[PDB]
């Protein structure tokens, strides 16, 4: 059946899961920008060595398609850890045009205010979108193998539960386009770091393909952690799109051999 992320009029995929209908949520594709060479053309990342003018114009292009001004975006450092920070209108603009002013040392953000667009960069790692429609909360986390080993997904649920007094049953999640087991192979150190994060009897999100080599499914790993954290199975939507496989739409750190652009994952609510 249809992927939860479907292409819109311009260069971006909207999250089609029902629980997200009340927000502006999606992932950009690589087309429609000003960037050149390995970054062609809609590179949204300011920290990958691309021309800054080109990247800021690409972000202005998206702000235009979304009718959500760049001055209202909030970005974070993305250090491949599991920390998350709550943001408000007072953080608007952080890391929007200058990477150095991004929220430091975290890999996830959440807000319960409208008019704030959470914006994170990806090119293979897992983008995890969160929403509590009733309470008006939205969240976004960046999960590579290190952040997943650190439990970033469950940490978001924990924070919403303990600090925002939201029940896991009131949370919905969408796991967007990322590299699949079809293209992502890792060794024992990687999978060993994930083991402790899953329930004792849980099915493993990997498959040994050769002695010491594993086809890893990070999307599934995060899905299992979210289930354990209390998020209902039917509230979790998962994209089947692989960033490495779908070269016509995405930049891929692995497929492009380390030098490439970044798509922007975003989520926010329009301020009347
Ligand atoms: Zn693939």
UniProtKB/Swiss-Prot annotation:
Binds 2 zinc ions. One zinc is catalytic and mediates binding to the substrate, while the second is probably structural. Zn(2+) 1 binds at residues 80, 125, 142. Its EC number is 2.4.2.1, 3.5.4.4, 2.4.2.28. InterPro entries: Cu_polyphenol_OxRdtase, Cu_polyphenol_OxRdtase_sf, Cytotoxic_necrot_fac-like_cat. The keyword Hydrolase applies. Zn(2+) 2 binds at residues 182-183, 242, 245. Its cofactor is Zn(2+). CDD domains: YfiH. One of its GO terms (molecular function) is S-methyl-5-thioadenosine phosphorylase activity. Keywords: Hydrolase, Metal-binding, Transferase, Zinc. Inosine binds at residues 46-47, 262. It catalyses: adenosine + phosphate = alpha-D-ribose 1-phosphate + adenine; S-methyl-5'-thioadenosine + phosphate = 5-(methylsulfanyl)-alpha-D-ribose 1-phosphate + adenine; inosine + phosphate = alpha-D-ribose 1-phosphate + hypoxanthine; adenosine + H2O + H(+) = inosine + NH4(+). The keyword Transmembrane helix does not apply. PANTHER family: PURINE NUCLEOSIDE PHOSPHORYLASE LACC1, UNCHARACTERIZED PROTEIN YFIH. Purine nucleoside enzyme that catalyzes the phosphorolysis of adenosine and inosine nucleosides, yielding D-ribose 1-phosphate and the respective free bases, adenine and hypoxanthine. Also catalyzes the phosphorolysis of S-methyl-5'-thioadenosine into adenine and S-methyl-5-thio-alpha-D-ribose 1-phosphate. Also has adenosine deaminase activity. Belongs to the purine nucleoside phosphorylase YfiH/LACC1 family. This is Purine nucleoside phosphorylase YlmD.
């Amino acid at each position: 059946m249809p992927d939860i992320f479907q292409q819109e009029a311009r260069g971006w995929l909207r999250c089609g899961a029902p629980p997200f209908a009340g927000a502006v949520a999606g992932l950009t594709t690589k087309h429609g920008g000003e960037s050149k060479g390995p970054f062609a053309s809609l590179n949204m990342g300011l920290h990958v060595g691309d021309d800054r003018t080109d990247v800021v114009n690409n972000r202005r292009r998206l702000a235009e398609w979304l009718a959500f001004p760049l001055e209202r975006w909030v970005c974070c450092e993305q250090v491949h850890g599991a920390d998350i920070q709550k943001v408000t209108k007072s953080d608007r603009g952080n890391g929007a045009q200058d990477f150095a002013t991004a929220v430091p040392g975290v890999d996830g953000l959440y807000t319960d205010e409208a008019g704030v667009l959470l914006a994170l960069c990806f090119a293979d790692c897992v983008p995890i979108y969160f929403v509590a429609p009733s309470a008006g909360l939205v969240g976004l986390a960046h999960a590579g193998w290190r952040g997943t080993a650190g439990g970033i997904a469950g940490h978001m649920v924990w924070l919403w539960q303990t600090r925002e007094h939201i029940a896991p049953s009131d949370i919905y999640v969408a796991i967007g386009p990322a590299i699949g087991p079809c293209c992502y192979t890792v060794d024992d150190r990687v999978v060993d770091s994930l083991r402790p994060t899953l329930p004792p009897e849980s099915p493993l999100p990997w498959r040994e393909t050769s002695p010491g080599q594993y086809a890893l499914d990070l999307k599934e790993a995060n899905r299992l952690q979210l289930l354990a954290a209390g998020v209902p199975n039917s509230h979790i939507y998962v994209s089947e799109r692989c960033t490495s496989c779908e070269e016509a739409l995405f930049f891929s750190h692995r497929r492009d051999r380390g030098t490439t652009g970044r798509m922007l994952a975003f989520i926010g609510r329009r301020e009347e």
